Design an enzyme around this catalytic site. Structure first.
Site, PDB file in Angstrom:
ATOM      1  N   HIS A  41       0.670  -1.400   0.032  1.00 60.69           N
ATOM      2  CA  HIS A  41       0.212  -0.077   0.217  1.00 60.69           C
ATOM      3  C   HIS A  41       0.845   1.307   0.122  1.00 60.69           C
ATOM      4  O   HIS A  41       0.265   2.352   0.146  1.00 60.69           O
ATOM      5  CB  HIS A  41      -1.180   0.061   1.139  1.00 60.69           C
ATOM      6  CG  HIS A  41      -0.273   0.015   2.578  1.00 60.69           C
ATOM      7  ND1 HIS A  41       0.360   0.963   2.950  1.00 60.69           N
ATOM      8  CD2 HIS A  41      -0.738  -0.819   3.399  1.00 60.69           C
ATOM      9  CE1 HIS A  41       0.633   0.694   4.306  1.00 60.69           C
ATOM     10  NE2 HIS A  41       0.069  -0.228   4.719  1.00 60.69           N
ATOM     11  N   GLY A 143       3.160   6.208   9.604  1.00 62.14           N
ATOM     12  CA  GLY A 143       4.368   5.884   9.099  1.00 62.14           C
ATOM     13  C   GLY A 143       5.070   4.564   9.633  1.00 62.14           C
ATOM     14  O   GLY A 143       6.291   4.345   8.996  1.00 62.14           O
ATOM     15  N   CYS A 145       4.405   1.604   9.058  1.00 59.70           N
ATOM     16  CA  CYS A 145       4.103   0.514   8.299  1.00 59.70           C
ATOM     17  C   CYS A 145       5.473   0.060   7.640  1.00 59.70           C
ATOM     18  O   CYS A 145       6.203   0.993   7.290  1.00 59.70           O
ATOM     19  CB  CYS A 145       2.891   0.859   7.188  1.00 59.70           C
ATOM     20  SG  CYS A 145       1.341   1.328   7.702  1.00 59.70           S
TER      21      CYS A 145
END
EC number: 3.4.19.12
Lengths: 302, 302
Positions: A41, A143, A145
């Site tokens: 993503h 952030g 991820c």
């Protein structure tokens, strides 16, 4: 002596963290050999996340649309491939800090260390368990991820988790390093049911053994129980059913302490039925289930 | 979101850990520039520790009696000096992995990360607080002496703790990196009184703010209190007295949440007087005091 929730030393993983930017989105990637792994993503805008067509979104990207920075070193992306929910970016340089490593899919109830990172930079490390319902109760801000979970065996890093999502309920979901989510979750910003969680009984028992080893022994009682009797209590209190496989894994701790597993089960039964009476065990006022039997032996044997 | 007891990434410290052997004793050392720092009781036998004359014991040692191994690399000891309770071994090679670093003496109630090590090899990392009575509640087995505690600010490692002793009560004592013990303790195997400990009130309050930020808000009440009224409760429950300096340090958290510090004190007062009623806060059934206000802001701001 003493017993702490202890993370693995994070240095071997720190050397693998990079920043991945695609368009406006920046998250963390894992650089191993000549491949950078990150959540797919990264190619989404905030609005794409409502219902993304990842295949269509990725087709609009070329190698040069992915900016990968390892600290000050900029990496050159020379291939890209989507594998389930992870993106694999082929870069022209092998990471010289690549540790010996494996990718593993862990089982619910196992534990691992998380190196929380932002913008490719490590901020902290903590130990947690994969819940029976395949969520984790982590510490993940915007952030984070692409931050990864791992175990270390001697010199080999076994990567088991990459962070992808915070559910609307505030718990966390992610994938193995092949991009397959743990649990039913998808990488889409919708409400997602996690389903009933339970307490990891074999871990609670391991921690009770840890407590005895360290001198907390007040919860030891004069009772014993049977597997089936205990499991009747386990079901009432939303604990995982105990199996003989769990009893077997607790074997070394039973041997070290001289406390038969079913005797420890009778202590736990009394604790579940009567509470802790304002007392504590290893500094906790609740029954702790994020230490595996292997964790307890590790920490108690150095 | 989510709130975890989080250690600093340990890699910069891992690169500094070495094994120090003197005669029959092996513990951990810290290799920075061309100096290795370790507990002076590396020169003691098990029987020396009852009443060691460190000056006399060290005089019987020469540079070649200290064996220092950084993994497979053996270091050559070219000078030795005792500074308070630490030994400083001058080696002929500067550690190429030396991070930017400082030595700091921390204040009671501050927190730090411990890299637990055995035989010069890191085994795990955890976060803890220096108790008001200058002990720490760690996880330290035989051979962990010389493991160090530290904080990290950007790229600078501030070393604050070296582990020396387990007290007969099972708590842990050690020095700053100049070899001065925290607290009244000495490096001798005798019974040693630690003295009354107290709960770190400003840290509990910080953690209550962390809880509000993350959505745990049931403990917020309709009451307020005064500094002096609250401190009457603090004294009854063996909490550190709250000062205006503590209120000031909580300022940013009060601003972020809109909850005045004295209002949060009235919530804490009710929690102390009435308990937690079988509820939990941030997954804990007791009031947590190992997060400083800076820790909470760090974790909540990434």
């Amino acid at each position: 002596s003493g017993f702490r929730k202890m993370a693995f030393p994070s240095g071997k993983v720190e050397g693998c963290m990079v920043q991945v930017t695609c368009g406006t989105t920046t998250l963390n990637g894992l650089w191993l050999d000549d491949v950078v792994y990150c959540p797919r993503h990264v190619i989404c805008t905030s609005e794409d996340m409502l219902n993304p067509n990842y295949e269509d979104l990725l087709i609009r990207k070329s190698n040069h649309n992915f900016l990968v920075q390892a600290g000050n070193v900029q990496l050159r992306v020379i291939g890209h491939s989507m594998q389930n929910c992870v993106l694999k970016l082929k870069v022209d340089t092998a990471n010289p800090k690549t540790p010996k490593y494996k990718f593993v899919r862990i089982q619910p109830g196992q534990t691992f260390s998380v190196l929380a990172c932002y913008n490719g930079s490590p901020s902290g490390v903590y130990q947690c368990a994969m819940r029976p319902n395949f969520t984790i109760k982590g510490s993940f801000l915007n952030g984070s991820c692409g931050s990864v979970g791992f175990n270390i065996d001697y010199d080999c890093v076994s990567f088991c988790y990459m962070h992808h999502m915070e559910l609307p309920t505030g718990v966390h979901a992610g994938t193995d390093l092949e991009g397959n989510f743990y649990g039913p979750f998808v990488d889409r910003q919708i409400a997602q049911a996690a389903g009933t969680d339970t307490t990891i009984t074999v871990n609670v028992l391991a921690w009770l053994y840890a407590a005895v080893i360290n001198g907390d022994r007040w919860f030891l009682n004069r009772f014993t129980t049977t597997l089936n009797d205990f499991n009747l209590v386990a079901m009432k209190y939303n604990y995982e059913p105990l199996t003989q496989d769990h009893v077997d894994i607790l074997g070394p701790l039973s041997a070290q302490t001289g406390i038969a597993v079913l005797d420890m089960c009778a202590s736990l039964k009394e604790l579940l039925q009567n509470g802790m009476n304002g007392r504590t065990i290893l500094g906790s006022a609740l029954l702790e289930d994020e230490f595996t039997p292997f964790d307890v032996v590790r920490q108690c044997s150095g």
